[PDB]
Amino acid sequence: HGKRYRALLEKVDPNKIYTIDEAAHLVKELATAKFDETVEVHAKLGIDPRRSDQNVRGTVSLPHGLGFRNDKTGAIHAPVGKASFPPEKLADNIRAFIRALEAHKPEGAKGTFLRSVYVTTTMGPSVRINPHS
Amino acid sequence: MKVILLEPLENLGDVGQVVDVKPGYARNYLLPRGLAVLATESNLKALEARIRAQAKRLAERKAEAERLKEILENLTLTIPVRAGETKIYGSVTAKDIAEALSRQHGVTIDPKRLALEKPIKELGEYVLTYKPHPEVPIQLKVSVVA
Amino acid sequence: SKVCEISGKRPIVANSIQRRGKAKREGGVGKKTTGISKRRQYPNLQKVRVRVAGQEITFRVAASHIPKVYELVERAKGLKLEGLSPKEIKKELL
RNA sequence: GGGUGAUUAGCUCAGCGAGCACCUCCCUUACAAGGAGGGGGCGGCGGUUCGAUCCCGUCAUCACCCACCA
RNA sequence: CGGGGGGAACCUGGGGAACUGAAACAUCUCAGUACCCAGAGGAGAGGAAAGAGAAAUCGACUCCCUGAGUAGCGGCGAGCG
RNA sequence: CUGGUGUUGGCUCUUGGUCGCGCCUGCGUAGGAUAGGUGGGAGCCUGUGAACCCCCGCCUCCGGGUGGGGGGGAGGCGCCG
RNA sequence: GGGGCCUGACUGCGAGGCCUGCAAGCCGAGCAGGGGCGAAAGCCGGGCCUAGUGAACCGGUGGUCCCGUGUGGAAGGGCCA
Ligand SMILES: [Mg+2]
Ligand SMILES: [Mg+2]
Ligand SMILES: [Mg+2]
Ligand SMILES: [Mg+2]
Ligand SMILES: [Mg+2]
Ligand SMILES: [Mg+2]
Ligand SMILES: [Mg+2]
Ligand SMILES: [Mg+2]
Ligand SMILES: [Mg+2]
Ligand SMILES: [Mg+2]
Ligand SMILES: [Mg+2]
Ligand SMILES: [Mg+2]
Ligand SMILES: [Mg+2]
Ligand SMILES: [Mg+2]
Ligand SMILES: [Mg+2]
Ligand SMILES: [Mg+2]
Ligand SMILES: [Mg+2]
Ligand SMILES: [Mg+2]
Ligand SMILES: [Mg+2]
Ligand SMILES: [Mg+2]
Ligand SMILES: [Mg+2]
Ligand SMILES: [Mg+2]
Ligand SMILES: [Mg+2]
Ligand SMILES: [Mg+2]
Ligand SMILES: [Mg+2]
Ligand SMILES: [Mg+2]
Ligand SMILES: [Mg+2]
Ligand SMILES: [Mg+2]
Ligand SMILES: [Mg+2]
Ligand SMILES: [Mg+2]
Ligand SMILES: [Mg+2]
Ligand SMILES: [Mg+2]
Ligand SMILES: [Mg+2]
Incomplete structure (x- = not known):
């Protein structure tokens, strides 16, 4: 890689599990990008994609504005916006969409579901965050 | 199983270290070869009681030296030698420097361990060093007559 | 006599x-x-030979109590007797 | 009631389309052996993707060592 | 200094059947009986709650009456309790 | 007869599982001839010796894939096609 | 024998009897609920009838919510199938 996140990886730690509100505020400072940062935080899920009965879909737009689908490998992705929103508001938006997921969580789906959510951007790292606290 | 090593045993470490090894090793090798003992309420007590004993004898030696260090780090001895001009007819041996210090200033010294090589054959001002373990510079003045 | 010399364990039915x-x-x-019949269970009985004062004392002990022999070995006071010195290291206080 | 294995054109197999066959054709002189061509054919559907005899629940039979049976 | 061996039955501990009953028989019964062994004594065992068990209760152990052929146990059989 | 385990220890080489993270990995003309999945995302990495180069390595679906080092020193360039 | 519409191959019961050592087996009008066919009277609690079958124990499975070992639950049982 470059020195983009080799300047930035000694301040942000993947090893020791973290929670949202303390690890939420660093998402715009962790991206050294030149342009237009669109943050994406994600976790994979414990449902077997090999059966379509357990899949999940929809379109639910976020309150704040532009600026959910599971794959066949069983992870989850979604855009939360554009550069736009600041660092301290996302404790409000970092628990926002994350509670729209579990709405359509399947019943015959087996296992702990939000597994490892790593707060990231298009431009950014692996850092542990709790889905809840 | 807890054993107190009686001898540095190399991977399973140093003397008096409390190491945990399998009972079979303990009972059929270490113990009967006098290589260790069971670490018990007693044998561990005797150990700690004797880690204190030594760390007293040592820490009262470093507080022995430095306690008679400052005596002769300040106090000075001057020894008149049968004159010559900046050459001594005799010398002053390390032995001699002892004898002086006893006679004037009343301290006692072994007297090995300053500089034994070259028993010093010239007049001048010298700074000589002492022992055991952290230690002293001393000041000897040599001049003339008796 | 398949009986632990330390614990007292002996065979049971x-x-x-x-x-x-x-x-x-x-x-x-x-x-x-389809059946019930009597059997026995023996204690897990082993030799442990240990050197005490001059001699070699060997105990028959249930493997559970093997440590007790070495505790009993520490216990060193004034015995110049025969290999029947064990009556002394046998138990005393316990 | 298990492990699950045997899943396959007409018969058997192999892949998370071949041999003994059958037909025309050579070779002998002839069974032959060979040598060359032709032949819907994959336990079962719903569903997966670009594609899927080459991805997943019912269960359709199949053995071997197995469970149990008032 | 003590032990050893004996003692009708009684006692505790270590071991421990079968006939029989189950109208056959194996789990079950007989039965922890008979018997063998060890050890107590004039008794032995037990005994001073890491107990009961539903009351904010009782209060060591032993023995009798009762609780009660109850609660249960049971090829839910015989029967045990 | 036999698995596990106790009695049962020292030193080694050797492997499987699985977990964590690091690391690579994969070809149905095509997009530009070498697309693992899928939503983002309109570029960027780059001098902390790029564009290539050479020796030296690893996997090789081999045109190709890929890192260590230096000869390396101011471009390659994403959608756009 | 043919056609149309249906599922009474009902649920809650059952006067009275046939048979009969017991246990069983058999027939059964009628009332209640909600239905089917019928304009209706009415019929319908499987089949023209008489064989097509198996006490109890133990256990499976669905259900009700009855019991739930100090109490709330739970374990397990009961009851209906
Ligand atoms: Mg057994
Ligand atoms: Mg018997
Ligand atoms: Mg031994
Ligand atoms: Mg043990
Ligand atoms: Mg004790
Ligand atoms: Mg007895
Ligand atoms: Mg009998
Ligand atoms: Mg008999
Ligand atoms: Mg009988
Ligand atoms: Mg009889
Ligand atoms: Mg008979
Ligand atoms: Mg039974
Ligand atoms: Mg009995
Ligand atoms: Mg008796
Ligand atoms: Mg007697
Ligand atoms: Mg009397
Ligand atoms: Mg009396
Ligand atoms: Mg008495
Ligand atoms: Mg009894
Ligand atoms: Mg490993
Ligand atoms: Mg009647
Ligand atoms: Mg009758
Ligand atoms: Mg009627
Ligand atoms: Mg009516
Ligand atoms: Mg009508
Ligand atoms: Mg009517
Ligand atoms: Mg019975
Ligand atoms: Mg039953
Ligand atoms: Mg209830
Ligand atoms: Mg209760
Ligand atoms: Mg209740
Ligand atoms: Mg209770
Ligand atoms: Mg129930």
Whole structure:
């Protein structure tokens, strides 16, 4: 890689599990990008994609504005916006969409579901965050 | 199983270290070869009681030296030698420097361990060093007559 | 004498019960006994030889109590006697 | 009631389309052996993707060692 | 200094059947009986709650009456309790 | 007869599982001839010796894939096609 | 024998009897609920009838919510199938 996140990886730690509100505020400072940062935080899920009965879909737009689908490998992705929103508001938006997921969580789906959510951007790292606290 | 090593045993470490090894090793090798003992309420007590004993004898030696260090780090001895001009007819041996210090200033010294090589054959001002373990510079003045 | 010289453990009588069938807890009709007969269980009895004062003292002990012999070994006061010195290291206080 | 294995054109197999066959054709002189061509054919559907005899629940039979049976 | 061996039955501990009953028989019964062994004594055992068990209760152990052929146990059989 | 385990220890080489993270990995003309999945995302990495180069390595679906080092020193460039 | 519409191959019961050592087996009008066919009277609690079957124990499975070992639950049982 470059020195983009080799300047930035000694301040942000993947090893020791973290929670949202303390690890939420660093998402715009962790991206050294030149342009237009669109943050994406994600976790994979414990449902077997090999059966379509357990899949999940929809379109639910976020309150704040532009600026959910599971794959066949069983992870989850979604855009939360554009550069736009600041660092301290996302404790409000970092628990926002994350509670729209579990709405359509399947019943015959087996296992702990939000597994490892790593707060990231298009431009950014692996850092542990709790889905809840 | 807890054993107190009686001898540095190399991977399973140093003397008096409390190491945990399998009972079979303990009972059929270490113990009967006098290589260790069971670490018990007693044998561990005797150990700690004797880690204190030594760390007293040592820490009262470093507080022995430095306690008679400052005596002769300040106090000075001057020894008149049968004159010559900046050459001594005799010398002053390390032995001699002892004898002086006893006679004037009343301290006692072994007297090995300053500089034994070259028993010093010239007049001048010298700074000589002492022992055991952290230690002293001393000041000897040599001049003339008796 | 298959009896631990330290703990006192000695052989006991136990029944051997042959059962057939499927536990009720598994939804079987439940288990049936096709035989019961007497057997024994011996203590797990081992030699431990240890050197004490002059001599070699060997105990017959249930492997559970093997440590007790070395505790008993520490216990060193004034015995110049024969290999029947063990009556002294046998137990004293306990 | 298990482990699950045997899943396959007409018969058997192999892949998370071949041999003994059958037909025309050579070779002998002839069974032959060979040598060359032709022949819907994959336990079962719903569903997966670009594609899927080459991805997943019912269960359709199949053995071997197995469970149990008032 | 003590032990050893004996003692009708009684006692505790170590071991421990079968006939029989189950109208056959194996789990079950008989039965922890008979018997063998060890050890107590004039008794032995037990005994001073890591107990009961539903009352905010009782209060060591032993023995009798009762609780009660109850609660249960049981090829839910015989029967055990 | 036999698995596990106790009695049962020292030193080694050797492997499987699985977990964590690091690391690579994969070809149905095509997009530009070498697309693992899928939503983002309109570029960027780059001098902390790029564009290539050479020796030296690893996997090789081999045109190709890929890192260590230096000869390396101011471009390659994403959608756009 | 043919056609149309249906599922009474009902649920809650059952006067009275046939048979009969017991246990069983058999027939059964009628009332209640909600239905089917019928304009209706009415019929319908399987089949023209008489064989097509198996006490109890133990256990499976669905259900009700009855019991739930100090109490709330739970384990397990009961009851209906
Ligand atoms: Mg057994
Ligand atoms: Mg039974
Ligand atoms: Mg018997
Ligand atoms: Mg031994
Ligand atoms: Mg043990
Ligand atoms: Mg004790
Ligand atoms: Mg007895
Ligand atoms: Mg009998
Ligand atoms: Mg008999
Ligand atoms: Mg009988
Ligand atoms: Mg009889
Ligand atoms: Mg008979
Ligand atoms: Mg009995
Ligand atoms: Mg007796
Ligand atoms: Mg007697
Ligand atoms: Mg009397
Ligand atoms: Mg009396
Ligand atoms: Mg008495
Ligand atoms: Mg009894
Ligand atoms: Mg490993
Ligand atoms: Mg009647
Ligand atoms: Mg009758
Ligand atoms: Mg009627
Ligand atoms: Mg009516
Ligand atoms: Mg009508
Ligand atoms: Mg009517
Ligand atoms: Mg019976
Ligand atoms: Mg029953
Ligand atoms: Mg209830
Ligand atoms: Mg309760
Ligand atoms: Mg209740
Ligand atoms: Mg209770
Ligand atoms: Mg129930």
